[PDB]
A paper describes a structure:
PRMT5 is a Type II enzyme, capable of mono- and symmetric dimethylation. PRMT5 methylates histones H2A and H4 on Arg3, histone H3 on Arg2 and Arg8, and many other proteins. PRMT5 partners with many protein cofactors, including Blimp1, RioK1, pICLn, MBD/NuRD, and MEP50. Our data suggest that a primary function of MEP50 is to bind and orient the arginine-containing substrate to the PRMT5 catalytic site.
Here we report the structure of the full-length X. laevis PRMT5-MEP50 complex crystallized in the presence of S-adenosylhomocysteine (SAH), the byproduct of the methylation reaction. The 3.0 Å structure revealed that PRMT5 forms a tetramer (a dimer of dimers with D2 symmetry). The two PRMT5 molecules in the asymmetric unit form a previously uncharacterized interface which results in the observed tetrameric assembly. MEP50 is not directly involved in the PRMT5 oligomeric interactions. MEP50 adopts a seven-bladed toroidal WD40 repeat. MEP50 forms a seven-bladed beta-propeller and utilizes a large surface on one end to interact with the N-terminus of a single PRMT5 monomer. PRMT5 residues R57 and R63 interact with MEP50 F289 and W44, respectively, by cation-pi interactions and are conserved among vertebrates. The prominent electron density assigned to the SAH sulfur in the Xenopus structure allows for confident placement adjacent to a small channel that connects the PRMT5 catalytic site with bulk solvent. This model suggests that the methyl donor on SAM would also be facing solvent and therefore this channel could support the entry of the substrate arginine guanidinium group into the catalytic site. In the Xenopus PRMT5-MEP50 structure we observed that these invariant glutamic acid residues (Glu431 and Glu440) are hydrogen bonded to SAH, in contrast to the C. elegans and human structures.
Numbering used by the authors:
A (entry chain C): 8 to 167, 178 to 267, 274 to 290, 299 to 305
B (entry chain A): 8 to 167, 177 to 633
C (entry chain A): 306 to 633
D (entry chain D): 16 to 318
The structure:
Amino acid sequence: RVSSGRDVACVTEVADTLGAMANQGFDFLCMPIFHPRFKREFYKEPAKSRPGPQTRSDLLLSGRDWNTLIVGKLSDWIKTDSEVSRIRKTSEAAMQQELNFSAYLGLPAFLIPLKQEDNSNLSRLLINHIHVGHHSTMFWMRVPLMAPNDLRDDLIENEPEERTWIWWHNFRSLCDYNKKIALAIEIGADLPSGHVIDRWLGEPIKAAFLPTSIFLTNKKGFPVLTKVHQRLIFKLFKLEVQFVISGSHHCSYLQYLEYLSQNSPPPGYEDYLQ
Amino acid sequence: RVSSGRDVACVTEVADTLGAMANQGFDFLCMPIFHPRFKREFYKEPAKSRPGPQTRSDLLLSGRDWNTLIVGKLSDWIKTDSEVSRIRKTSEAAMQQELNFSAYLGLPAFLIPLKQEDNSNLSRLLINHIHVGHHSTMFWMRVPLMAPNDLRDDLIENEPGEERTWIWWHNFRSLCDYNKKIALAIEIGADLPSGHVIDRWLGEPIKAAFLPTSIFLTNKKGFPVLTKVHQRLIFKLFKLEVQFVISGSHHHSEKDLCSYLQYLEYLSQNSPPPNAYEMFAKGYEDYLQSPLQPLMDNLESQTYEVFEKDPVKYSQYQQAVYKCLLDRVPEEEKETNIQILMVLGAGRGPLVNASLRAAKQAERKIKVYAVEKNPNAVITLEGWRYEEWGSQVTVVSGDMREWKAPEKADIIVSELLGSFGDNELSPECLDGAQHFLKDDGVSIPGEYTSYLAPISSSKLYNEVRACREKDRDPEAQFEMPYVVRLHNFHQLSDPLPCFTFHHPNKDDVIDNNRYCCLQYRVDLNTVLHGFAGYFNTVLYKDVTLSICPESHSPGMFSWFPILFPIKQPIPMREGDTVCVRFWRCNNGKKVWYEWAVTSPVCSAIHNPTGRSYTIGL
Amino acid sequence: SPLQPLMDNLESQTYEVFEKDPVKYSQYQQAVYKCLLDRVPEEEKETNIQILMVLGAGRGPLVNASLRAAKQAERKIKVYAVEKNPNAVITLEGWRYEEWGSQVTVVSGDMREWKAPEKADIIVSELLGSFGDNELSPECLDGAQHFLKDDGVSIPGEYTSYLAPISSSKLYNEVRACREKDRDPEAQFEMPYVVRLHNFHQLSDPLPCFTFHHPNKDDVIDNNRYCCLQYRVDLNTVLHGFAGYFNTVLYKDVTLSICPESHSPGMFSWFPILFPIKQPIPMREGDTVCVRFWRCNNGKKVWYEWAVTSPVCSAIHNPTGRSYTIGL
Amino acid sequence: CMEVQIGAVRYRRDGALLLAASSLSSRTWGGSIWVFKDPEGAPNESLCTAGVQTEAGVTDVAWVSEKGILVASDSGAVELWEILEKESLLVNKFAKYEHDDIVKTLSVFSDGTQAVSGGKDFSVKVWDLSQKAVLKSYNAHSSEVNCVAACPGKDTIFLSCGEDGRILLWDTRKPKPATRIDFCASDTIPTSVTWHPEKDDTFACGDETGNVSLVNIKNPDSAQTSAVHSQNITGLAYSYHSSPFLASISEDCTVAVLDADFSEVFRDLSHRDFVTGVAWSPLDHSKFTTVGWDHKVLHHHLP
Ligand SMILES: Nc1ncnc2c1ncn2[C@@H]1O[C@H](CSCC[C@H](N)C(=O)O)[C@@H](O)[C@H]1O
Ligand SMILES: Nc1ncnc2c1ncn2[C@@H]1O[C@H](CSCC[C@H](N)C(=O)O)[C@@H](O)[C@H]1O
C-alpha cells in the first residue's frame, strides 16, 4: 500500500520534524545523525581538541523510534577515496565514527552515497565495520541511475548509461555481495534503456529516491510523472520497494504514488531455490 | 486464550466429529489415522493379501485442515518391543506404515504412547523415520505422570517409586539423542507425584497435557471441577503455554464437553499473579548467550538501556556514595572540603547522577570526572554535561588505563562487574586506573568475589551441544562460558568462593592470574554437566550486591548466573566428591578461564591457552 | 607461512639459517663501516665514542659485525645489544662474558618498552621480512626511535616493498590444497606465502608498494598504507596472485634487494612472497591490472588486505585480518 | 544567546559588523543573524544593535545595499532580512525555498538588486532581489557548489567553483554562460573564489589541499600558486588598498595574508578551531576581522 519516506538535508528539530512528516503521510525519515556541515579534525591541534558534543544524543528519541523511524545519512564531506592523503585519513576516521554511531542507535538502515567509480577504500571500511561485531544494520547504497555529469545542462562551451552500473557492481563485488548491503536507486530526469532498468531491478533494491524536481505540474497545479517514469514506478511496485521523497516542497506527492497504485496494470516462487 | 484439543477413541464420520468438537470450543482433534482395531498382517497369507484400502483417504480433508486441525494417533496394538519375534516384526512393519502416512498427510503432530521402560526398538524406528527425509512433524510422546499399575485400585488379595515413568521418557529421549522433533505429552492421573518431580517434568519440552474426564470432580451443581492439587499443576502448565487435551466420555458429569473447557478458561483468568517470576519474562527463560564484553566491544544504546533498568544497582551505588562521603568529610568541613569523585565507565549517565544526588543527600560538595572509552556513550554523556550537569562534571573520552588525570581522586566509582564478577575484566581496568587515586582513596566497589557450584542440567548441556558453529573446533562450544538462568539447571552443592579482587590492590606485584581447587560432596545420584558461576560485591561498608543462591543481600535480580559447561558429562553416585581445578589467565593481550574436573573422574582441561574463549585486553 | 620473529621466539636452528648468508653480514658490516667514518672525523679518532645500539641482536652476528666495523674504521663504539627472545639472550651473554666485554651491554626486553639510560648515535636492526615490513620492522623501530639522538643514524635507513602480477597454476593448486579443518575453507587464499621464483611466471615489472624510512620524522606516525598499482598485460594468461619483493638502504649507497632485475647484492638473501587470489582471472593482452593493496594496523594486530579491480573486479581478500594477521 | 559555531562575517560601509552563527552540535540545529555597529562588542549579544534567529542554520550572509541582508539557510532557502535600525529589530522580507539542498554560498552584485546562489543540490541560481524571485537556475556543476563570487562592476558576470573540480566563469547573456578555467595543478577541488579589485580578468582561488592561487583568465600559464595553508581554504578576501593584500583562512585554524607579489606578511594562530570568516574594515584599511567555530571574533592589523 505504498510505504514512503522523507529525505531531508538537515533537521533543526527532530521531535518536530517527525510529527510534521507524519502528518504528511510519511512512514520513516532519512536524516543525518551528524550535522552535514559539522566537519571535525582527528589528528591536528587545536581543532582535534574541540570541546562539546559531536552530535545530538540518543536520548532525543526512544529506542523504538531509532529502530523503526530513522534512516541515518552519511556526511557528504566524507571522501574515503580522495587522492589527498590527509583527506583520506580524516574521512576514514569520520567514516568509522558515523558507522559506529548508527549501530549504537540501532538504526534499521544507513545511507551511504556512491558519487564515483572508485569506492575501494569505502568498501574496505564498510565490510570491516560489518565484520567487527556491529550488526542488524542494513546499508542502503544511494546510486543514481544516471551520472550527475550526464544529467547536467549543456552550459559549458569548453566542455559539452553503463557508468553508474559499474559503480554499484564494482562496490558490491568488492564487498563480496554482503547480505547487509542493499541498493537505493535515485531517479533522474532522464532514464536509461529498458534493459538496463530491468538489470537494476535484479539487484537487491530496498528503496527508490524520487527527486521533487522530476515531477511535472499539471493543469490544476498537481504533481505528475511522465509515462516513462510511470512504467518504472510500476516495476518498482511489484518489488515492494520503499519510495523516498527528496528535494524542496516547492508535499503530498504520495497521493500521485497511491494514484499510480490503485490504478496499476495487473500481472511468489521467484526467489525459490531448492 | 487457552488452546485445547479433543482426544477421541475412534471416529465414524470425520467431517461430523470436527464440526462437533469445533462448536465445543476445541482447536484441534486427536484422532487415529488407522482404525485402532484394524490389526493387519504383513508376512503371512491369506491375511497378507487383504483387499480394500488400508484406511480412509486423504481427500476427506483439505491440506489446510490436515496441517492445522489433526493430530494423528498411533495404533495401540502395535508393540514394537514385544519379546515375541512374530509380534515385533509385525509391529515394526506397522510402525513404519502409520508414520510414513502421518508425514504424508502433513500432520503437525503425531501421538505415540510409552507404556513401559523398554522402548529401545521404538526409538530405532522413530529416529530412522526422521532421518529418511520425512520431517516437520512433531512427535508427542504420551507419558503418564504415574504408572497405570500405581494408579489402579488395590482390589487383588494375592497382589497388593513415582519416578518410574520418568525413566520411560528419559531413556527414550536419550536413545533418540535428544532429537528436536520429539516432544512430551504428559498424561495427568488422579494421583500426582512430588512437586520436585513435577518441576522436573515441566523442564522437558512439554507440548501438550492430557486431562482425563475421570479426574474431574462433579460439583453440587453438576459442573466439572478439578481438585486444588490438580489446579496448581494446571497453573504451572499455563505459563509454559502448553495445549490441553480432554480424553474420555463427558458422561461423568451432567454437562457436556464445553463445560470442561470453560473451567480451564475460568482457572486461566483466576490464575495467581506471577512474581519471583516475570523478571525474566517473557522471556529470558531459555537464555543461552555469550557474556557481553563492554571492554573489547562498544555497547549499543539499547544494551545500556537494559543495564539501566534495574533500580537496585542504582540505589545501592547511590547509597554507597552517600555513606562514603559522610565518612571521609565531617560536619565542620561541610563546605570547605570538596571531594574529588571519578566515575570510571560512566556509560550514558546513571552512575554520575547517582553520585550527584548522593552528594546533595549527604550535603557534601563533589568535583565529578566522568570518563568513558565508548565514543558513542560520550556523546550521551556530553548531552547531560551541557544541559543538566555543568562545569562540576568533566567528561573524559578514553580508557581509564591510559588516561592521565590532572588531579588525584578521593573516590572512584565503577560498575564493570559481570555475571562471574571479574569476567568483564574489572580488575585490569581498575588496576590501570589506580595510580590517580589518592593514598587514602576509596574505590567503589571495594571488593568482589566469584563463586562456583557443581550443577546438573541435561537441558542446558544439549543446548550447548547444539551450539556447534561451522569453520571452528566442533567441541569449542563446551570450552566457553554461557549466561544462563537458574531454573534451567539443578545445583548439586552449595557454591564456594573462587576468586577475590579488592581495590585498590596494594600488593607488591599485582597479578590477576588465579588458581584454586574447589571440592564438593555429592548427596544424590546425578550427572555433572558443568558449573554455575555467581558473584558478590561490597560497594561500600555494609552496602553490598550479590547474585549468590541463598543470599540475603539485594541484587538477586540484577545479574543472570554464568555457566561453565563440560565436554564429557559425569554420572555420579552419592558420597562422591567433586574437585574442580579453575584457572584465570592473563597473558597481557587476552584474559580467559581454564577448568578441569579431577573427581570423581578425571576429565581434561577445558579451553587450554584460551583456544576457544578469551576476553579482550 | 612467513615467520614472525616478533610474535614468536625463533629457535636456535632458525637463527642458524638466517646467519648462513655472508652477504647480509658483509653489507651490514660495510654500512657501520661507512657510517662511523662519516659522523666522526680523523682528529676525533679517540676523543669521540659513538653510541651504537644493535636492536634485535639475535645470537650475536650483528654485534660482531659492528665491532669489527669499528676496528676497520679505527673508531671507538659503546655497544648495546638488546633482544626480547630470552633464549637468544642466553647466547648473547655467552659472547658477553667470554669475548666482548664491558663495552657491550646485553639487554633483555622489547625495544619499544626498554628505557635507554643513554641516547644512541647509531641504531642497527635486521627486522626485514620477504615483503620488507611484514615482520613489523616499522612498529618496532618507531617505538625505539625516542632514545635515538636528534642527529642519529638508523640502519637500515629505509626500505620499500614491491608487487608484481604473476601466473602460476602450480602455486595456486598448492595453496588450494592448504585447506585446514576447523576454519574458513577459503582462508588459505587470504594469506601470504613464502615461495620461490622459478615456481611462478611474472606478468609485469614490479611496482613500489609501501616505503618506510627511519627515523620517521612525520607529524603523526601512521603505518596504515594504501596504494593502487596498475600493470599492462602483454600475453594471454591467468592471474593467480602477486609476488612481493623488497629493497632496502642500510647506509648511503650500501643496499640490499631481492627485486627481480636488481644489480644490488642480496638476491639470494630472501625468498619472495606470494599474495594468492581466490578466483583466478584469465586475461587477454592489452588488459590492465589494477590492484588495491592495504596495510592495516589496529593497535593489536597488523595485516594486509588486497583486491583486484581490473580487468575483472574481485573481492577484498583478508578483510579485517580475518584469515591472516601479524602480532603486535 | 548566539550559537557556538560562527559561520560568516561581513563589514558594512560604516563599520557595522555582520556575523552569522549556527548550532552544529546541540539538540537544536538552528541559526541566527547578528548586526554589530560596534565590532569590538562581538560576539557579546548584549552589545549588539540587532539580532534574530533563523528557522535553520546559516551557511553564508551578505550585505544588500545598506539595509538589506541576504541569508543562505540549511533549509535550502535564500532569505532577505532588513534592518529596522534603532528599533533593535530584524525583519524578514522573503524566504524562497528554491534549492533542493543546503545553500552553501551566495554573493551580491554591485548594483545591490541581484545576487547569485550556490547550492548543495548542484544548482546555481541568479536572484532578482527586487521581485523576490529567481531569474534563471543553472545546473552546470555535477557536484556541490562551494563558492560563488559576483564580478564587481559587472552585473552579468560571476565565478563559481564546486566539488566537481570545475571553476566556471559566467556570463548570463551567452546561450552557454559557463566557461571552465584551467591552470597548473587545477586537478584539485576548488573551495573558494574571489575577484581581484584592481586587476582585470584576474581572480584568487583556494583548494581543499591548502593552496591559494592567483589566476589571470587571459594567459593562465602565469598563474601564481602558493601552499599557504595545510587544509581546506574556507574563505578569501582582498583589502581596500590600491595594491590589495590577500587574506586567507582555512581549516588549519590559521589566518594568513599575502601581498601583491604573493609573499606572506601576516599569520595569526590565535584561533582554536576552524576559522570560517574574514572581512576587511572599510574604516581602517589595516584592520580585518576573522571568526571561527571557537566562538571567537578576532581583529587583526597589518605591520
Ligand atoms: N578501561 C576502560 N576505560 C574506560 N571505560 C571503560 C573501561 N572498561 C569499561 N568501560 C566502560 O564501563 C562501562 C561498563 S557497563 C557494565 C555493565 C555491567 N557489567 C552490567 O551488566 O550491569 C561500559 O560502558 C564501558 O564503556
Ligand atoms: N620489538 C622488539 N624488541 C626486541 N627485539 C626484537 C623486536 N622485534 C624483533 N626482535 C628481534 O630481532 C630479531 C630479528 S631476526 C629477523 C631475521 C630476518 N627477517 C631474516 O629473515 O633474515 C629476532 O631475533 C627478534 O628476537
